[PDB]
Design a protein around this ligand. Structure first.
Ligand SMILES: *[C@@H]1O[C@H](CO)[C@@H](O)[C@H](O)[C@H]1NC(C)=O
Ligand SMILES: C[N+](C)(C)CCOC(N)=O
Lengths: 409, 406, 395, 425, 387
């Protein structure tokens, strides 16, 4: 016969699960927490939520559920459904949804001395305020805040689990069950007991256990798929300085089209970053910079076209301008005779007008070359600087800058 | 009333709703299953599910719920909460979500002879395999498979529901004109019902309700097909523009990008199954490839138009075809001072004559370009018209069968 | 049924569902677990979640629930609510978006020998490591790890029904093809509980994506624009439209890049070949734009200020044109009047000289375009043959 | 607190059965008064054809088992009981979209010493509302909430509209109540009519539960300023740009680009309009009709610009200016359309004669080209005069036909009653 | 604990959680209600719903749950499940996409004098009337109307715990800033129940949007493209690209306007200033396109069919150019003899026609300089005005 049947009937008989198991008035139940991360499912940027697949290990002592193993044929561990027992209402407070408690209410391992061991699984969605300053070269500092929803520090004493005397101050990671995210690398994973000193040992919010996850984004996907195309397309603006400054040269076409492509890329980025307004993402800063540079290049194309396509009819080529831009930066017989004279004169005048047009075209070309050099320098420096400051965003060496401890097993 | 309370106390004194009513071991409970459709809400093509608002007309006999009306002040039938009586676990087996059971647990009607009738309402999301071949000129064949999740043929015998005058079975979905909203995008063509078995499983039996529905494609026509017809018209036009206009590439490329954008935005509404290419996507791809070839041929015509003796020499075959043979068929027929002054006049005249010959050869090249362009115009007009007409004629000849085959 | 009513009353009269169904606490419950796959609802590549419609068949013995048919009119099987009897706590370890355990407490079948068969339904939303490296010609291998949660192998033991999950009633997907599927049993030692093994059954399915939809809707337009890329070299410079063509191709490709990036997950573990090929095509179009800008500059080179280098002339007018066999290239006041005619003649001579030099420059530009057209057509065909290990052209 | 004693007597000592109708004889009928209060018309999703409403359902009936003598107990004139302890009528929204049939919050009932029970729970209802897109965005919709009693047949409980007293005479409440203290006015939808009807279907029987219902209708008119400002004005301006594209000279080299860009903008507007409407085939939306008409007209404009360009770039080397086209496009139409307006000497003589002949031929060629240019200008002027009036008249007609669309000023066309709160019948 | 077990058994033995906690039915229960805003989860402008994470603190006295601590080992407080005792039915009147009442039945704290403290959490999805006038620099005022549903003022009375909601533990939004917040108690008479007033507490939060996401993603590109509008006037007609540039600018502006249309509700109560300004910018750009087409047509006017009118020559060639300063504008021998005379005559005519055409070109140039100056003036006055 299964003696567990009569043992459990004895234990749960005359047992009230609403009563905190305090032996005396001043007894404080010590509740021990330990988080085992099995999968970092995702960090939803749009809603700023970190989803994790964890096993939360909760341990306490319930003196009511203790027995003498000799009276039950050596049974020293039984499994009782958690719905039948008193539990410390340990919940994830910083949850995006309304899910405070665990997902699946597993059984509780009850040992003969009253030790209760509860290890339910959970899919936790917790708020992670996302810093976009260095997107996509960013590292996020996500937190999981655990505290009792019901009992205050005068009743329940939350603590971190300790094995072999040493406290486990980190998110445990079982090698038998763990999967790499593929987009996020877990760099640090400390855990500490925190206090809200604005409160007192009452109010149920005085004490909490915080498990941290300093995760670094892998940017190769973002580089290859967004940044490299964006830089390559933005670099096309500098080509407009080698197109002819006349009808069919298509300087403005190229410039405006590069501007439109950058706008498309801005829309593309808008689908990847959160809609918060605390900072502009690094890639967003680069996009704004290149769009402004392309606007400047459109203006310069318009100006060079205007200069090149000038004529003596509308504009006069000043001698000072010419010097500056070309010296430093770079019966029947009489009627027939009259007809011939006029023909020669008209040809000469047309040729002179053509020569003036040629001078204007040359001035345009010189301006075009100088502005090409300026634009190339500007674009190269901007790109290099922005993505170098992106590449120099290291994850801090220590989980907490003040502490000298590494918080690793 | 007091007497109803007494009757309820007597009926359920020892009644176990967990036990299937079989007055003798081995008896089978006959369950009549009928479906009433109040609204066909959605046929979501992306996830391939049909959402319907239905009543599930169930009927069976429970010998334990019998009483003599004369002994209870003439009470002949009771309304009882569904959870107080045994009911067959009739569920929608092919739901797309996890919802197998009904939503609204109405009271069951129990008559004094033990006959129990139950008409719970539900919002069922049933998986429907979508045939994308003729989208949006398509008819879908969506089914709703109902059977007892728990009891097999050895325990319950599923039957068809009876009509109002319970003399003949109703082998179809019942639609109530008073309570029924037409979809507005789908028209119901057939709605049969049929009991299905499995030759490899003698314990399996279900009642399946089929909805043979036909789509009304006016939305898709107006918002995708006519704009693409206009784009194809522009693509045909590009061959009437003269090469000197400097706008041939603009027009052809604009048409190409427009049709590509139409395909990209239509990719949202079509299903993502790979068993076939919908007729609308096939038409869009045909137009896109036609416009791409229009771009290629416009580039060729522009290249031909801008040649000259200084760069190209016209080969014999080009002159033979495009100058002589095609144009008829295309209807596109086309004192030292005096001596030196004399020398200068000679030079001017020779320059003029050489320029005239050069321009004559250039005009020959431009005429070749014009003739080739006219040929392309005719060919592309024919191909575009024939292809569009053929595709849409094939689409138009796609109607559900008269016999639902079920 | 009176007999069945009495039997059900007697079975559960003094039955405790919190206790394991064993006759001695030393023994273990042997549970035969069989996973039946009904439908593959979805495969969310971006979120890396696979939704499947399954039945979780479980069988075990409960000696407390046995009866003698002769005492109950010959009843040999009954249906009991699953909430009435002890049920194993079988949990899906790799759950990502759904429930860990079974939530649809359907009725179970109980024989008179105590044998129980329980087949509840479930929608499993399990984590799926999506390998976007051959997309859209990829195959996926993601699993469903099932195991008893709170009982070790010495208390409750699970064994698969068969080496493979049951797909007898599987509903064809239309987006994926089932290549292979197995169920492997594991004895896992966790750092929580290092003295006893926990039993586990991991079912895995090899899914081969059917690529027709993605081919037609993504790849064919991209290939079309890529082919049009090299067409800009056949467009003459006098047309004044080369930038139009090249830039339109580039904009189309950036839009399609937007589509690609919103198609696949952002994981960086493996570089998607579709993304790499799109980047290479963008580099291709950018090089086309750069070199056609160079050609346009060459065509419009002013002979007055630029003089053709001897090497340029030799290479692009004396040797390369002879190599292209399939191209059709070419390889008183009366005095005042007298000086007026003089001036006209001299100006025409100078104009002819300048025009001949400009025409030489244009010839060089044309030769460069022909070279680049040949090179870019060769590169495009070589590329389109060899993408996705040729699976695109094979399809 | 004697409420405890009263409740114990009512529910325990009297053995109240929650699952029995409150009747003394099985053949009696329970009358259920029903009224609806609209506190917020949350949304009307045209794509989903769903109406979301924040309403208070008001049920009232008599339970003879919940009567007491207010003097035997303390003077208790009212009592609050949870709905799961007393019999309540299960009135459900039959035409819901989601699976929500009942009310959101099951609040306490109010019971008076005479057995009059009232129940005023709140609910968020997502009803099915077919959308008439014929006149979008100048449309009015006719949404309804149909409530049925599926737990009992018409022979067991009778639905009714709740009555109200004004001068001692009862009049039914035949409208949705809009409480000024708890109503939020929707910024997009304006409630015109809000009648309530108790429908009976004689083709059915009181045997069953499909014989009766109470339906609350909601004729709401859309406020179109948003769509007029944001969707119609830009579209109209960009469309007029097309007609303007006829005034560009053929030498500009941008006629085709202008017309094509206008067409592409119109296509984008058409696609965005498609995004906002349900995919029903009942009728093409008014704005959809306008966009299709204008896109067709702009395609005609593009084709005619192509014709103009083809005519302009003709030359004697490839075409011949026939007398018919000449007299049509240079004589008649320009006036109709009011458009503006020793051997060395011999060699020298031979060479100058050759030069003169070539210049004369060149001038004749240029004259022919100029004539072709004039023909092109006449053609595009005629095109402008023929097309721009069509564009403006079509725009005005389509957007005046929409503006001349109002709700019918009376629900239930055959019913002369106003169904207004201010004139109860 | 044995003492606590016995106490809890004694308290709820004859307790009926359906009766109001009042010694006499003519009294009322005074409930101290406080709202504690934990986090502003979302603000859906299109759907006009505000989703907030709050903790609803409620306090009242239940005389039926008293005890003498000396009789129970000196116990002075216990935690009880909410389901075990009478609770007030606070309802969010303006719920839009959530629950009307509290569904998280957490445990409550019970004092030995009968005082009860209950602070269940909730996710309120309340209706929020969005004012789009100053988007994206707008501030929003929307509230949570909490009141007892079934009990009138004479049976259950609720009072605000504090004049303001508690935001001590509020998580900073990153999209919004709480400028002000307060809670007002109201006595409301409803047409349902006209004899007695129903009490409620309306908590409102004045939240100002942080306008940087939309400045970077919407306003800056729009300003860039609008500023490119004036470049058309400085682009010469000979370039053959005025219409390309102007059309591209107009298409980009309409694309961004259509994007903005998706960020705001479709209500017609107010016209956003951003939308109105974008519409005016499009009107200006289309007027500029009209004038650019007129300028292009003028520049290509053939003197053969057009003679410059006097009112044009006097004004555009003699008046504006002098006024505007910043620019830098302004045998067979007889056959041969007849032929050379004919050539000279053709040069006569060509020179005259070219002179007329150049006059037309000059008129076009002065026109587009006038437009460019107008645009620069508009831009300067606009940029000074905002500063
Ligand atoms: C329905 O009503 C009709 C007409 O009174 C009657 O003949 C029939 O027996 C009724 N059936 C039921 C099931 O009430
Ligand atoms: C007061 N009110 C209208 C908000 C709710 C009415 O609830 C009752 N009194 O039954």
């Amino acid at each position: 016969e299964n003696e567990e049947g009569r043992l459990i009937e004895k234990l749960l008989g005359d047992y009230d699960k609403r009563i905190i198991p305090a032996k005396t008035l001043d007894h404080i139940i010590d509740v021990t927490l330990k988080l085992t991360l099995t999968n970092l499912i995702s960090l939803n940027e749009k809603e700023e939520a970190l989803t994790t697949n964890v096993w939360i290990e909760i341990q306490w002592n319930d003196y009511r559920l203790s027995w003498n193993t000799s009276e039950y044929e050596g049974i020293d561990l039984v499994r009782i459904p958690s719905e039948l027992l008193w539990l410390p209402d340990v919940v994830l407070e910083n949850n995006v949804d309304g899910q405070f408690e665990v997902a699946y209410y597993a059984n509780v391992l009850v040992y003969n001395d009253g030790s209760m061991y509860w290890l339910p699984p959970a899919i936790y969605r917790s708020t992670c305020p996302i810093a976009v300053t260095y997107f996509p070269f960013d590292w996020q500092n996500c937190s999981l805040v655990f505290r009792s929803q019901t009992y205050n520090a005068h009743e329940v004493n939350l603590q971190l689990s300790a094995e072999e005397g040493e406290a486990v101050e980190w998110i445990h990671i079982d090698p038998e069950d763990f999967t790499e995210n593929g987009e996020w690398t877990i760099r640090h994973r400390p855990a500490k007991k925190n206090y809200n000193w604005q409160l007192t040992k009452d109010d149920t919010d005085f004490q909490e256990i915080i498990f941290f996850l300093i995760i670094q984004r892998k940017p190769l996907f973002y580089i290859i798929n967004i940044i490299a195309p964006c830089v390559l397309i933005s670099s096309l603006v500098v080509l407009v300085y080698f197109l002819p400054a006349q009808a069919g040269g298509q300087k403005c076409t190229l410039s405006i089209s590069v501007l439109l492509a950058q706008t498309i890329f801005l829309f593309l980025i808008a689908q990847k970053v959160p809609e918060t307004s605390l900072n502009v993402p690094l890639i967003g800063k680069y996009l704004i910079f290149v769009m402004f540079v392309s606007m400047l290049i459109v203006m310069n194309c318009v100006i060079v076209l205007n200069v090149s396509l000038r004529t003596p009819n509308t504009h006069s080529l000043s001698e000072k301008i010419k010097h500056l831009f070309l010296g430093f930066l770079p019966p029947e017989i009489k009627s027939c005779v009259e007809a011939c004279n006029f023909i020669a004169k008209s040809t000469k005048e047309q040729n002179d007008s053509g020569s003036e047009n040629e001078n204007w075209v040359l001035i345009g070309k010189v301006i075009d070359k100088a502005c090409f050099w300026i634009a190339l320098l500007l674009f190269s420096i901007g790109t290099l600087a922005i993505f170098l400051t992106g590449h120099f965003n290291q994850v801090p060496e220590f989980p907490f800058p003040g502490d000298p401890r590494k918080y690793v097993p | 009333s007091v007497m109803e309370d007494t009757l309820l106390s007597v009926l359920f004194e020892t009644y176990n709703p967990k036990v299937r009513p079989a007055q003798t071991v081995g008896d089978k409970v006959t369950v009549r299953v009928g479906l009433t459709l109040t609204n066909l809400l959605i046929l979501n093509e992306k996830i391939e599910e049909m959402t319907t608002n239905v009543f599930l007309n169930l009927a069976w006999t429970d010998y334990r719920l019998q009483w003599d009306p004369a002994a209870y002040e003439g009470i002949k039938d009771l309304r009882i909460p569904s959870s107080d009586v045994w009911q067959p676990d009739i569920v929608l087996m092919n739901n797309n979500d996890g919802s197998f059971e009904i939503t609204l647990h109405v009271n069951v009607l129990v008559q004094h002879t033990g006959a129990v009738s139950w008409q719970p309402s539900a919002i069922y999301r049933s998986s429907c395999t979508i045939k994308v071949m003729y989208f949006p000129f398509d008819w879908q064949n969506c089914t709703m498979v109902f059977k007892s999740y728990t009891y097999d043929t050895s325990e319950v015998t599923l039957q068809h529901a009876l009509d109002a005058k319970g003399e003949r079975e109703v082998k179809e979905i019942v639609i109530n004109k008073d309570a029924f909203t037409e979809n507005g995008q789908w028209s119901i063509e057939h709605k049969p019902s049929r009991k299905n078995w499995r030759s490899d499983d003698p314990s399996y039996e279900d009642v399946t309700f089929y909805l043979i529905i036909q789509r009304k494609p006016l939305f898709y026509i107006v918002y995708t097909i006519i704009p693409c017809i206009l784009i194809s018209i522009l693509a045909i036009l590009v061959f009437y523009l003269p090469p000197d206009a400097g706008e041939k590439m603009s027009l052809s490329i604009s048409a190409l990008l427009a049709v590509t954008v139409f395909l990209l935005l239509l990719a949202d509404k079509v299903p993502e199954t790979s068993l076939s290419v919908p007729i609308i996507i096939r038409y869009l791809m045909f137009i896109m490839i036609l416009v791409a070839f229009s771009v290629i041929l416009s580039v060729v015509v522009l290249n031909l138009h801008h040649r000259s003796p200084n760069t190209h020499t016209m080969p014999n075959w080009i002159r033979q075809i495009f100058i002589e043979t095609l144009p008829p068929f295309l209807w596109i027929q086309r004192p030292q001072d005096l001596k030196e002054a004399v020398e200068a006049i000679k030079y001017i005249a020779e320059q003029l004559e050489s320029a005239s010959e050069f321009d004559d050869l250039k005009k020959d090249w431009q005429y070749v370009a014009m003739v080739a362009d006219r040929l392309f115009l005719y060919v592309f007009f024919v191909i575009c018209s024939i292809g569009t007409f053929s595709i849409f004629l094939d689409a138009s000849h796609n109607v559900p069968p008269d016999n639902p085959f079920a | 049924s009176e007999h069945e009513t009495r039997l059900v009353a007697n079975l559960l009269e003094n039955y405790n569902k919190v206790i394991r169904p064993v006759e001695h606490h030393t023994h273990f419950v042997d549970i035969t677990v069989g996973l039946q796959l009904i439908q593959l609802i979805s495969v969310d590549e971006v979120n890396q979640i696979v939704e499947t419609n399954v039945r979780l068949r479980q069988q075990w013995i409960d000696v407390r629930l046995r009866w003698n048919p002769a005492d109950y009119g010959g009843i040999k099987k009954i249906r009991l609510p699953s909430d009435d009897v002890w049920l194993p706590d079988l949990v899906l370890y790799n759950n990502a978006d759904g429930d860990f355990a079974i939530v649809h407490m359907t009725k179970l079948l109980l024989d008179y020998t105590g044998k129980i068969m329980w087949t509840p339904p479930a929608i499993f939303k399990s984590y799926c490591e999506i390998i976007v490296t051959h997309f859209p010609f990829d195959q996926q291998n993601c699993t469903m790890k099932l195991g008893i949660w709170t009982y070790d192998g010495t208390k409750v033991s699970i064994s698969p029904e068969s080496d493979r999950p049951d797909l007898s009633t599987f509903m064809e997907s239309g987006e994926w093809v089932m290549k292979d599927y197995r169920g492997w049993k594991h004895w896992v030692y966790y750092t929580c509980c290092p003295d006893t093994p926990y039993l586990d059954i991991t079912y895995h399915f090899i899914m081969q994506r059917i690529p027709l939809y993605f081919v037609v809707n993504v790849i064919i337009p991209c290939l079309l624009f890529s082919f049009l890329t090299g067409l800009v070299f056949y467009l003459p410079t006098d047309s004044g439209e080369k930038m139009t063509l090249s830039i339109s191709v580039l904009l189309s490709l950036t839009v399609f890049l937007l589509v690609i990036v919103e198609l696949i997950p952002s994981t960086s573990s493996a570089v998607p070949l579709i993304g790499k090929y799109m980047l290479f095509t963008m580099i291709f179009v950018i090089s086309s734009i750069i070199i056609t800008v160079v050609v346009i500059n060459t065509h419009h080179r002013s002979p007055s200020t630029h003089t053709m280098p001897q090497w340029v002339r030799k290479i692009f007018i004396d040797t390369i044109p002879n190599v292209m066999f399939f191209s059709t290239m070419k390889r008183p006041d009366v005095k005042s009047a007298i000086e007026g005619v003089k001036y006209i003649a001299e100006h025409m001579k100078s104009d002819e000289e300048s025009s001949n030099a400009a025409e030489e420059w244009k010839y060089v530009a044309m030769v460069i375009d022909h070279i680049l057209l040949c090179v870019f057509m060769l590169i495009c065909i070589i590329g389109t043959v060899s993408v996705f290990a040729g699976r695109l052209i094979e399809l | 607190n004697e409420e405890e004693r009263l409740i114990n007597d009512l529910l325990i000592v009297n053995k109240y059965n929650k699952h029995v109708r409150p009747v003394k004889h099985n053949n009696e009928v329970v009358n259920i008064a029903l009224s609806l209060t609209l506190s917020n018309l949350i949304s009307l999703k045209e794509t989903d054809e769903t109406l979301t409403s924040n309403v208070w359902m008001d049920h009232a009936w008599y339970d003879h088992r919940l009567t007491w003598n207010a003097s035997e107990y303390s003077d208790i004139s009212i009592l609050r009981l949870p709905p799961e302890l007393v019999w309540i009528p299960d009135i459900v929204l039959q035409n819901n979209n989601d699976g929500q049939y009942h009310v959101a919050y099951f609040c306490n009932v109010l019971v008076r010493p005479n057995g009059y029970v009232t129940w005023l729970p709140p609910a968020i209802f997502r009803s099915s509302c077919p959308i008439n897109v014929l006149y979008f965005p100048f449309d009015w919709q006719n949404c309804s909430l149909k409530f049925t009693a599926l737990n009992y047949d018409a022979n067991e409980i009778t639905m009714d509209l709740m009555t109200d007293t004004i001068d001692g005479k009862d009049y039914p409440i035949e409208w949705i109540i809009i409480d000024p203290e708890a109503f939020t006015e929707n910024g997009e939808w304006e409630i015109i009519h809000k009648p309530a009807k108790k429908n009976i279907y004689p083709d059915k029987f009181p045997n069953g539960t499909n014989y009766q219902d109470v339906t609350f209708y909601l004729i709401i008119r859309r406020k179109p300023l948003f769509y007029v400002i944001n969707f119609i004005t830009p579209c109209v301006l960009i469309s007029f740009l097309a007609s303007l594209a006829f005034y560009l000279p053929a030498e500009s080299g941008e006629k085709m680009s202008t017309a094509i860009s206008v067409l592409l903008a119109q296509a984008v507007f058409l696609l965005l309009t498609s995004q906002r409407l349900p995919e029903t085939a009942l009728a093409v939306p008014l704005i959809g009709k306008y966009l299709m008409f204008i896109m067709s007209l702009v395609t005609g404009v593009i084709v005619n610009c192509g014709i103009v360009l083809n005519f302009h770039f003709r030359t004697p080397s490839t075409h011949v200016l026939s007398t018919r086209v000449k007299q049509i496009f240079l004589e008649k139409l320009p006036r109709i359309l009011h458009m503006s307006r020793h051997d060395e000497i011999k060699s020298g003589i031979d060479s100058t004669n050759y030069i003169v002949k070539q210049i004369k031929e060149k001038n004749a060629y240029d004259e022919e080209v100029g004539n072709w240019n004039l023909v092109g200008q006449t053609i595009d002027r005629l095109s402008m005069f023929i097309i721009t009036p069509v564009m403006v008249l079509g725009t005005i007609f389509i957007f005046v036909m929409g503006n001349f669309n109002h709700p019918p000023a009376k629900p239930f066309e055959g019913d002369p009653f106003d169904y207004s709160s201010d004139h109860p019948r």
